Amino acid sequence: HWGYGKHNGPEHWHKDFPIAKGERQSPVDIDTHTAKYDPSLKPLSVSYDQATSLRILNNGHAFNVEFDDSQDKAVLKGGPLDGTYRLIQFHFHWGSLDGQGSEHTVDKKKYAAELHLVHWNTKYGDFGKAVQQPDGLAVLGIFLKVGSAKPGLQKVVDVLDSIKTKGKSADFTNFDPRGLLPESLDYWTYPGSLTTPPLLECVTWIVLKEPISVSSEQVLKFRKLNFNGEGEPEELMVDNWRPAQPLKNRQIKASFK
Ligand SMILES: Cc1cc(=O)[nH]c(SCC(=O)c2ccc(S(N)(=O)=O)cc2)n1
Ligand SMILES: [Zn+2]
């Protein structure tokens, strides 16, 4: 039922998922002047050398590039995290226009898109158990602006016409997510939630300050995907982002300055 239209978009989700109005919802606006530099925060450790991508899936909301997370191969640690979080998938949220699409904002600035690399805390054994814990997930968020192409994104873009509609998947092996990272790992972090239903409050968010640049042609191909299934009226997959939610009783911390 839920999605991103007038009839079933973010402003409706609370009726099936009442935590939509909870105390630690995501995304948020990152007010860079009031984020506190925390000299106790560690460099993030992103260890993606042995990542094993398997498949890419249009799930009707976004596309997910999925990884084999049955061993400790692509892991996030350090930063604000205790313990070791394993990469399970990444996906993006993007707009119908270059001036919107990100979920997080920075001093109210929206970016053209935002990439989420989703990781789960290995102390909980698997992703389905982790989402039921307040420290179950760590999502690394990276902003996309439109400018020069991102060469490490092109393999993803070029497979999208094979997964145009909801429910389609394609083999997607040997994809290296290190090609999607900016140069700096400086970040903001705060406790929050999944940004789509079920909206569970299980995520430590780590949002990088440096955006990556993608070309206008790369994001135009994201906007050619469809939310609908094959044989249904075409609804372009655009504007699949949740707007910023109330910060409430939270403190965003900065790893830098
Ligand atoms: C309990 C449960 C199980 C599941 O398979 N998916 C979900 S929601 C989908 C999901 O895995 C997910 C959703 C949103 C985000 S986000 N947009 O916060 O990074 C990350 C992962 N919830
Ligand atoms: Zn997301």
Quick one: 1-257 is in which CATH superfamily?
A: Alpha carbonic anhydrase (3.10.200.10)
CB-count exposure of residue 59 (10 Å: 0-12, 13-18, 19+): middle
Domain map (residue ranges) of the chain: 1-257
CA of 192 to the centre of ligand 2 (A): 12
Q: Which residues pair with 145 in a beta bridge?
A: 213
Ligand 1 pocket test: which of 85, 87, 194, 207 has the largest number of ligand atoms within 8 Å of its C-beta?
Answer: 194
Identify the nearest ligand to the CA of 196 by its number.
1
- CB distance 252 to 183 below 8 Å: no
- The data reach a resolution, in angstroms, of 1.3
Query: What is the C-alpha separation between 174 and 155, in angstroms, rounded?
Result: 10
Q: Is 12 a catalytic residue?
A: no
Q: What is the DSSP code string of the chain?
A: ---SSTTTSGGGGGGT-GGGGSSS-S--EE-TTTSEE-TTPPPEEEE-TT--EEEEEE-SSSEEEEE--SSSSSEEEETT-SS-EEEEEEEEEE-SSTT---SSEETTBPPSEEEEEEEEEGGGSSHHHHTTSTTSEEEEEEEEEESS--GGGHHHHHHGGGG-STT-EEE--S--GGGG--S---EEEEEE--SSTT--S-EEEEEESSPEEE-HHHHHHHTT-BSSPTTS---B-----PPP----S---EES--
- CB distance 84 to 208 below 8 Å: no
Q: Which of these is catalytic: 7, 61, 104, 119?
A: 61
* Elucidation technique: X-ray
